[PDB]
Amino acid sequence: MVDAFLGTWKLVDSKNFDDYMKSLGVGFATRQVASMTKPTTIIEKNGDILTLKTHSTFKNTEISFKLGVEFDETTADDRKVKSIVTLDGGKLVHLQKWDGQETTLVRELIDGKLILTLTHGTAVCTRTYEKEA
Ligand SMILES: CCCCCCCCCCCCCCCCCCCC(=O)O
């Protein structure tokens, strides 16, 4: 099910991440650093538990979850959200809810690259990651 997503991924392109961050209320100085950061995302499974690590020179995060089971998450920008991750159409769909707001983080594989689409409000960001050997 999730197996083609597993591994270590490096950011190789980013479109509209500033728009997405601004929509979430991220401050200009943080957006400024984030716009020049290239994180590494590591996705691993142990049985039904997935762990997703995002590493950078600026901020690091880690979450563990079971598909289809809600979990508490504190995001990189310090939002305390209710999260759920599912597979939908072969895409890994992560929905975050807080204060009546929502954002989606949708991952899919196209030609071997991992495409992350981030939507909040009207902002739509597309980030492309390439697999590390
Ligand atoms: C956590 C590792 C850093 C990720 C690179 C961006 C650097 C920090 C930006 C922090 C403020 C904006 C955070 C809004 C959440 C987006 C999470 C997913 C982005 C991605 O994994 O590429």
Swiss-Prot record:
BP GO terms, sorted:
brown fat cell differentiation; cholesterol homeostasis; fatty acid metabolic process; intracellular lipid transport; long-chain fatty acid transport; negative regulation of cell population proliferation; phospholipid homeostasis; positive regulation of long-chain fatty acid import into cell
Task: Report the Pfam families cross-referenced here.
Answer: Lipocalin
Q: Where in the cell is it found?
A: Cytoplasm
Any idea which residues bear Phosphotyrosine here? 20
Highest taxon in the source lineage: Eukaryota
Which residues are reported to carry the modification Phosphoserine? Answer: 23, 83
Ordered alphabetically, the record's keywords are: Acetylation, Cytoplasm, Lipid-binding, Phosphoprotein, Transport
Residue list for modification N-acetylvaline? 2
- Give all Phosphothreonine modified positions: 8, 30
What residues bind hexadecanoate, as annotated? 127-129
Where on this chain does (9Z)-octadecenoate bind?
127-129
* Residues binding octadecanoate: 127-129
Which InterPro entries does its entry note?
A: Calycin, Fatty_acid-bd, ILBP, Lipocln_cytosolic_FA-bd_dom
Q: Name one GO molecular function term.
A: cytoskeletal protein binding
Q: Name one GO cellular component term.
A: extracellular exosome
Look up keyword Calcium and say if it applies. no
Report the PROSITE patterns cross-referenced here: FABP (PS00214)
Sequence similarity: Belongs to the calycin superfamily. Fatty-acid binding protein (FABP) family.
PANTHER family documented for this protein: FATTY ACID BINDING PROTEIN
Q: What is known of its domains?
A: Forms a beta-barrel structure that accommodates the hydrophobic ligand in its interior.
- Biological function: FABPs are thought to play a role in the intracellular transport of long-chain fatty acids and their acyl-CoA esters.
Full protein name: Fatty acid-binding protein, heart
Organism of origin: Homo sapiens
